[PDB]
Scaffold this active site. Sequence first.
Site, PDB file in Angstrom:
ATOM      1  N   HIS A  52      68.614  23.953  87.837  1.00  7.96           N
ATOM      2  CA  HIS A  52      69.286  22.667  87.790  1.00  7.96           C
ATOM      3  C   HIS A  52      68.332  21.556  87.332  1.00  7.96           C
ATOM      4  O   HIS A  52      68.679  20.701  86.504  1.00  7.96           O
ATOM      5  CB  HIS A  52      69.884  22.358  89.168  1.00  7.96           C
ATOM      6  CG  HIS A  52      71.012  21.388  89.111  1.00  7.96           C
ATOM      7  ND1 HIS A  52      71.007  20.195  89.795  1.00  7.96           N
ATOM      8  CD2 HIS A  52      72.185  21.430  88.431  1.00  7.96           C
ATOM      9  CE1 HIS A  52      72.123  19.536  89.541  1.00  7.96           C
ATOM     10  NE2 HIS A  52      72.854  20.265  88.712  1.00  7.96           N
ATOM     11  N   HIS A  98      74.380  17.073  81.931  1.00  5.46           N
ATOM     12  CA  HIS A  98      75.231  16.153  82.684  1.00  5.46           C
ATOM     13  C   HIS A  98      75.736  14.994  81.843  1.00  5.46           C
ATOM     14  O   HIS A  98      75.217  14.729  80.755  1.00  5.46           O
ATOM     15  CB  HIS A  98      74.475  15.585  83.879  1.00  5.46           C
ATOM     16  CG  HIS A  98      74.010  16.631  84.840  1.00  5.46           C
ATOM     17  ND1 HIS A  98      72.729  17.140  84.809  1.00  5.46           N
ATOM     18  CD2 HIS A  98      74.659  17.293  85.826  1.00  5.46           C
ATOM     19  CE1 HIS A  98      72.602  18.057  85.753  1.00  5.46           C
ATOM     20  NE2 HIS A  98      73.754  18.168  86.386  1.00  5.46           N
ATOM     21  N   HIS A 125      78.011  24.333  84.428  1.00  6.85           N
ATOM     22  CA  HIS A 125      77.961  24.660  85.848  1.00  6.85           C
ATOM     23  C   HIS A 125      78.789  25.907  86.155  1.00  6.85           C
ATOM     24  O   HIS A 125      78.443  26.672  87.059  1.00  6.85           O
ATOM     25  CB  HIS A 125      78.413  23.467  86.688  1.00  6.85           C
ATOM     26  CG  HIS A 125      77.429  22.335  86.700  1.00  6.85           C
ATOM     27  ND1 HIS A 125      77.504  21.280  85.815  1.00  6.85           N
ATOM     28  CD2 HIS A 125      76.339  22.098  87.472  1.00  6.85           C
ATOM     29  CE1 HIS A 125      76.519  20.432  86.054  1.00  6.85           C
ATOM     30  NE2 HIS A 125      75.791  20.910  87.047  1.00  6.85           N
ATOM     31  N   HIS A 172      82.645  14.430  92.442  1.00 10.22           N
ATOM     32  CA  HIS A 172      81.397  15.148  92.318  1.00 10.22           C
ATOM     33  C   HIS A 172      80.176  14.314  92.710  1.00 10.22           C
ATOM     34  O   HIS A 172      79.360  14.666  93.567  1.00 10.22           O
ATOM     35  CB  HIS A 172      81.214  15.682  90.891  1.00 10.22           C
ATOM     36  CG  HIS A 172      79.909  16.343  90.811  1.00 10.22           C
ATOM     37  ND1 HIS A 172      79.602  17.483  91.567  1.00 10.22           N
ATOM     38  CD2 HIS A 172      78.763  16.025  90.064  1.00 10.22           C
ATOM     39  CE1 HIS A 172      78.329  17.857  91.288  1.00 10.22           C
ATOM     40  NE2 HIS A 172      77.787  16.993  90.367  1.00 10.22           N
ATOM     41  N   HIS A 209      77.497  14.469  96.259  1.00  6.21           N
ATOM     42  CA  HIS A 209      76.039  14.470  96.163  1.00  6.21           C
ATOM     43  C   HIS A 209      75.413  13.251  96.855  1.00  6.21           C
ATOM     44  O   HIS A 209      74.426  13.369  97.566  1.00  6.21           O
ATOM     45  CB  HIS A 209      75.621  14.521  94.694  1.00  6.21           C
ATOM     46  CG  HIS A 209      75.582  15.912  94.138  1.00  6.21           C
ATOM     47  ND1 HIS A 209      74.433  16.469  93.630  1.00  6.21           N
ATOM     48  CD2 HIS A 209      76.540  16.866  94.037  1.00  6.21           C
ATOM     49  CE1 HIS A 209      74.680  17.704  93.228  1.00  6.21           C
ATOM     50  NE2 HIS A 209      75.952  17.972  93.464  1.00  6.21           N
ATOM     51  N   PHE A 242      69.562  15.326  91.006  1.00  4.14           N
ATOM     52  CA  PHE A 242      69.747  16.622  90.351  1.00  4.14           C
ATOM     53  C   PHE A 242      68.582  17.550  90.599  1.00  4.14           C
ATOM     54  O   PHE A 242      68.763  18.756  90.739  1.00  4.14           O
ATOM     55  CB  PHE A 242      69.869  16.494  88.823  1.00  4.14           C
ATOM     56  CG  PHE A 242      70.988  15.610  88.332  1.00  4.14           C
ATOM     57  CD1 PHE A 242      72.239  15.604  88.928  1.00  4.14           C
ATOM     58  CD2 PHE A 242      70.771  14.797  87.226  1.00  4.14           C
ATOM     59  CE1 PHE A 242      73.251  14.789  88.439  1.00  4.14           C
ATOM     60  CE2 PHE A 242      71.778  13.986  86.735  1.00  4.14           C
ATOM     61  CZ  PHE A 242      73.018  13.982  87.337  1.00  4.14           C
ATOM     62  N   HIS A 248      79.819  22.896  94.404  1.00  4.85           N
ATOM     63  CA  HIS A 248      80.087  23.006  92.985  1.00  4.85           C
ATOM     64  C   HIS A 248      81.119  24.068  92.691  1.00  4.85           C
ATOM     65  O   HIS A 248      81.816  23.975  91.681  1.00  4.85           O
ATOM     66  CB  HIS A 248      78.822  23.270  92.179  1.00  4.85           C
ATOM     67  CG  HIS A 248      78.723  22.375  90.987  1.00  4.85           C
ATOM     68  ND1 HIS A 248      77.876  21.290  90.939  1.00  4.85           N
ATOM     69  CD2 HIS A 248      79.437  22.350  89.836  1.00  4.85           C
ATOM     70  CE1 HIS A 248      78.038  20.663  89.788  1.00  4.85           C
ATOM     71  NE2 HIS A 248      78.985  21.280  89.106  1.00  4.85           N
TER      72      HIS A 248
END
Lengths: 10, 9, 347, 347
Positions: free
Chosen positions: C93, C116, C125, C252, C256, C273, C286
């Site tokens: 990642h 991203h 992903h 999303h 996080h 990330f 995810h």
Amino acid sequence: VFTTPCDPEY
Amino acid sequence: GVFTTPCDP
Amino acid sequence: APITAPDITSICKDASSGIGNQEGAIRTRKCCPPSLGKKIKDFQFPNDKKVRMRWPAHKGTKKQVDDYRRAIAAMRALPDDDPRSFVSQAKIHCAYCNGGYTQVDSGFPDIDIQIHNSWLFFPFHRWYLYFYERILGSLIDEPNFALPYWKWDEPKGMPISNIFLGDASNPLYDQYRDANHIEDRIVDLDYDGKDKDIPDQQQVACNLSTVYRDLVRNGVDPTSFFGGKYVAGDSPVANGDPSVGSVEAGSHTAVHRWVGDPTQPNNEDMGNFYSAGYDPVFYIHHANVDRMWKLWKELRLPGHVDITDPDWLNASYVFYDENKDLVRVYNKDCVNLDKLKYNFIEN
Amino acid sequence: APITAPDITSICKDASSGIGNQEGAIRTRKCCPPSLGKKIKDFQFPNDKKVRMRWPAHKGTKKQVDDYRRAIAAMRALPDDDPRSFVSQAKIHCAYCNGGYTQVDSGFPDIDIQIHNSWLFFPFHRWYLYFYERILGSLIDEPNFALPYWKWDEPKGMPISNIFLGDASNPLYDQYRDANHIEDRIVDLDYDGKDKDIPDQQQVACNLSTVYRDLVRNGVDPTSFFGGKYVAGDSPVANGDPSVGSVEAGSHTAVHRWVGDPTQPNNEDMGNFYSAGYDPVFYIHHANVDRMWKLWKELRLPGHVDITDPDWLNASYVFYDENKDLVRVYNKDCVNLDKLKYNFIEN
Ligand SMILES: [Cu+2]
Ligand SMILES: [Cu+2]
């Protein structure tokens, strides 16, 4: 696909 | 707005 | 021309982008994958006899939970530089999200690859998880192993599952989570940096409303759902750019931000990330993000179609698989879940 | 060809459509307007120096509430046959919704006009309310009079306002309401004929979900929001038809059913078109329905555009105004609230 707060099973 | 959702205070 | 990962074992540098406090960073930035003398080969569709059925993390059977926990323990027990290891999977990642690779294979050696904040988000992903899942299953010799998924679009699924909780004797635990929020348990899919202080039932209703926001209100066509167009020669799209897709920028990002530990320098682990993969829940969150793509297509509404642009179809990444082989994968090949031999248990 | 109201003072018949128990009806079916010798004139846009600002029924100033109550009192005291009278104004709904007029002016003298269950829903009631509001202001010499609106899209606005409650000494009161539901206070925008028996805060969430449903999930284009195409030669669309627009079939219908008194033969007053106008809250509910059209446009989403079909634009109705003149009004002329010199107080 999604439940809502109106549904009996929420 | 535009309209209220449950996320609003 | 499509974005194309290089030979990641030959062209890679320490992650240096998108991390505000690198001198104080609690995880490593040396995120490049190991070298094992492997030649990169193209993906071949799996011949699994059965379809892997990912399970809601609040509804797992004892066997499902025990297998998942044991697989993560096995993954943690591997030496760091084994590409199947807990650390190596987290580093994937970091490499792809924080500037490990460049667009050298496309003629742009001076521009990094970022997966991203564009239309690469969902397929990258999906592939990351595809190999992650098959790697976990191999470690405990379970050929139909499937990941749990955090079903935060269903009320009883919204509290973070107790399987992740407790202390470091639990392989699924991570100390670097927001302690206040773990006590609250119910994730806020609308989290924007301030705690809401509303009743649990209202947060449940808020989360349901947020799912409709990302999937219907704002996800009205492929550009708004998957995110903006990003091709060879483009510079990295910034975090928070409005061209980012509805789910990526919405629920999303919220999960996080909510799980990340604000007492850490970069809100590690889930809060950046580069460190997110050191939290086992990263992959399980995810997995539901992956599911949103499935649900979005199922809504059968105007504009809910997959991308047909060749510069998206032919974009590719490189991953290690459970045999420690290097596999190149393309966006076009992950649009059909039946062909990837997995899906999600549904009501 | 567009639906065109006839000279309503020359061609009119008693209401006999959509009323299940006529002999037991507690309101009249003789809903034809009076004949005063007036000539039908075309609408002229108003020259108000100030925009009338409709106010949430739960947040009115003392003057706002006092003026509204006094104006309804004045309307109730007018002679019956004054076209501005309380009963005359209620009869309008009966005539246009329960078979008072034919399509004679469109070449179909044996087919009724129905303004419900089609794309005529929103503009007909916009005009109905426009004249009703101006009439009420005129009766008390308040040239900037504005109606309240039942803001059931806002949690605090969901309970029926106490300004409507009490007994007959209150001009805003109507005995023909569901007594059980008045006691509950909080309207169910998802009402289907059976009480839900859920916590108030869950009902609030359900209401918010219903507004999201009507304005975003189901009202995705003019056909699905405004309702089906209804033109000269068409017979009346049935209640419950799949072509009825999202709001009309959804939150709108729910409120009427919920307030209507089930111990009455036709669930009078709000529980049937022909009787709804005898409840002052009818107009105040409908003022927020009118506001839904505004909000739906302001969302700025794909498909959220006004109708441009000539057969909608050029449809027309006839009303008495505050001067007892007869006015013909067209759909095309009510799409812009600034030109009608009113709007809604927003947060
Ligand atoms: Cu990522
Ligand atoms: Cu009506």
